Design a protein around this nucleic acid. Sequence first.
RNA 1: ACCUCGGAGCAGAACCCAACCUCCGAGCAGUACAUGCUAAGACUUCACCAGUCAAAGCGAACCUCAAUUGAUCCA
Lengths: 80, 143, 354, 95, 65, 49, 19, 74, 53
Amino acid sequence: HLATAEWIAEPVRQKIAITHKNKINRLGELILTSESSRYQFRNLADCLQKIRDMITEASQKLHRIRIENMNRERLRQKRI
Amino acid sequence: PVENEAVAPEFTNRNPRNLELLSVARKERGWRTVFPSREFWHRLRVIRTQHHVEALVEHQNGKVVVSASTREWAIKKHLYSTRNVVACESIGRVLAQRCLEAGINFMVYQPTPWEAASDSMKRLQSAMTEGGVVLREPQRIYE
Amino acid sequence: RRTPPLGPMPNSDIDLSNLERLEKYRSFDRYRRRAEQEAQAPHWWRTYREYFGEKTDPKEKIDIGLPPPKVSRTQQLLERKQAIQELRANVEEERAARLRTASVPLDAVRAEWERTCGPYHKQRLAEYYGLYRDLFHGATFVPRVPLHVAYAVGEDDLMPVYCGNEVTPTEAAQAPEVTYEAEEGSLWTLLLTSLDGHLLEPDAEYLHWLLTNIPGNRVAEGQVTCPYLPPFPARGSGIHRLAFLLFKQDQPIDFSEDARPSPCYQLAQRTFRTFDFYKKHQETMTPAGLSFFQCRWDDSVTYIFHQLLDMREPVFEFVRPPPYHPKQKRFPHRQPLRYLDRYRDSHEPTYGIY
Amino acid sequence: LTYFSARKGKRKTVKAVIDRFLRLHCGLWVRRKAGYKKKLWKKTPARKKRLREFVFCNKTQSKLLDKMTTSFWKRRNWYVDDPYQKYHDRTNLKV
Amino acid sequence: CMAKMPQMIVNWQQQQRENWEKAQADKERRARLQAEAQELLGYQVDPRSARFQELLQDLEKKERK
Amino acid sequence: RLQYLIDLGRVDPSQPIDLTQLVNGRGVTIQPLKRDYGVQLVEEGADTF
Amino acid sequence: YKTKPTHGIGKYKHLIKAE
Amino acid sequence: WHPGAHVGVGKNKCLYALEEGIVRYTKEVYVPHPRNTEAVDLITRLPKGAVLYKTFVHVVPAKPEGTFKLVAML
Amino acid sequence: SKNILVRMVSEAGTGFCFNTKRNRLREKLTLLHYDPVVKQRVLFVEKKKIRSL
RNA sequence: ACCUCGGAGCAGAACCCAACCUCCGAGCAGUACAUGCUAAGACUUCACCAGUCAAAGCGAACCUCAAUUGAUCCA
Ligand SMILES: [Mg+2]
Ligand SMILES: [Mg+2]
């Protein structure tokens, strides 16, 4: 669970929450998997390293997406 | 155990346009020897007759998606000639509007050399670009 | 060996005794036009279309719907000729055309288009997107009655709704405003359905917004059987096309198989089959209006999954097949050393007994 | 080739195959394609990369090279920083 | 060397361009040979007078400078 | 394999494990004339150890 | 192909002038 | 022969499959590219009303691009 | 003795070099090329000859 | 007189096919300098050697001809 982790700060917690909505569970608990290697020790290692990278970067096709978003938001210009 | 929670492993969507919207569909690559390149998903075909001007946005299957015509009363009543640069650029603007209407954000138009050098087709392209459509098809995803 | 031709092979009609008198393809454009003529036409030999085309049945598609009104073609051409007459008689249009400085009202053009011949093109778009083959298993109709819908974003601005538009779940979270220009008196029925929203089976659809017995254009008075709930396009599932359907209820009909309680968030309740639904309830009425749009996953979809629907949210993903590789062989010849990596399972090494 | 020597009465390896090729304990052999350092100016990029890439040897000349060299060169070896530990063994081979 | 590359790259463009202008300068002179007739050996006869005239004029200008 | 050894009980963990003890338990044979400078530890078997 | 009825479908030399 | 329907062409005029599936041969019309001068001038010299044909290869895509599968029910 | 095969060099100092054909009469020439090390189009100058062709 | 390679007939229609058989040629040339790197899958001059086509990705823009040629060692 993210919000219960006291060892993380308020802004970093909310940053991770808003940035990684996809992984958060219904009950609010974050999950993350790794299955690159056969060694579960190394899997857990890269898991927690992903965690640390997320923490650091939080403490710090897309073209097409933007295109159709601009098209939609220029079309939707209408009055009641 | 909830009937709403019940979910199958595989999800079957019967929307043919889903893949081409996700950029994942397969385009009919080939025909490098023949002039019309089939590696598209939505092609624009323009017909410049000596009486009227037609435009059709269609799918690779050869079937029409949307149409614009100078023969139509709704369009020709606000005009002077059915073939001038004015008519060409107006049909271009209307077709860009109709594409934004039917959700068509991307499409393709391969002209001949003289058709490309013609000022009418150039102003049509500019009209569609300012309408909000680009005449470049995205690059397919796979690997 | 030779075999005679089955059907008339091409270029057989022309004569060869007289060749210089013949007219030629002076233009690649004319030759191309003739090429597409012969491609349009059928052929007895094997062709590209009979392999890669939808193979529509030869029978016409059944549609017992609103016929066109009896418009006097005589007076129609009369008034059109008069219109073009004063058009050509005008004075400024000459300079406008010869200087390329004219324009046209897009909104008005759209208005008279959807008034005159819009319905045919909207039917074309429907049969393209696949509404008919999935909803009615082939049968069609013509949406003679126009139809406008809007999702008011707050209250200042609004997202319009027309055939084949993107709609955000955040904007579709509420009920839309609707207009279909029918105060005649005869009743109407409206239903918002999701075609590919069902997940447990194909040939299934959900229903989000049902209204029946709508006297005139006013919509608030129209009773509701299936209350409102926005769509829930799952992340990675792709895109889901949502259809507005509108039928001309000639006389009030009851709803028992159809009567559903308070929303209760039950997909087994929201699901049904439009085919037998129309076959049962709609034998008195016919289609009058049709529209649709396209929707995708969103944070509001996640919210309604976790809170509203009272269930976990699904998470799908597109997956390509595995890359083909032929059988191995004990002694490859002239194959690079990465042939073994093409088949190795683990990227990391392993030692058998050590 | 030299099936019995005069000093020990044993088979003898030709150092040519050793300098040219490499045997993996799977039984396979590899070689550098001929002409990868000659006349590169006229050769097209695809051709020269095909020549640079390593390749295996079919079973006849594999068995030939085996008969030519001795068992000391067929034994298992555990080198350090030798990238071919992944290839000295075989994986998922049927028939 | 990288920090220096852009200047020499612009200089390379200028080299190409000046070679291109020299190409125009000589091909425009080659364009008009003679109009009186279509001879075989005369081709390289009449123009040499004007060519040597221009060369001597340039040389005299250089000496004057 | 090391777990297998210590379970079979031929090598005693009570004392310091050394290469000579491995060779006397026959955990690994060695060929010094074949210029093997020693023994490597392998990642395999990190689990259940 | 020759044996099949589609033989001679592509030929054009007799359509164009010969020289 | 000529390509078509997911079949490319190498510099040596060899045909190669771009997708995985079944092959078919058909006969269709041949509209050249304007840069092909000899083809264009042949089309011009051609008499009106007459049209040529040429063979084409077409691989029928057997399998789809992929499938949507459930990853996590959360 | 019409043409000549000549080597050109990376002026960056990387030491990356390659070869190409040149006309015997045309003078020195300096061409852009993609240095795999520097990883962008950069000018290489040709120094000497190797063999005629 | 020839000794290598390529095109055409003999070999007419998937492949291959010889003769001190019948004909024509080649032992280069021209343009770029991404004529950069990597990679699935396949062809293959009847073995091997060699010789071929190429999806995709990175990194970039926005090759033609028909043969047009040469292994290892060694320098
Ligand atoms: Mg072979
Ligand atoms: Mg590529």
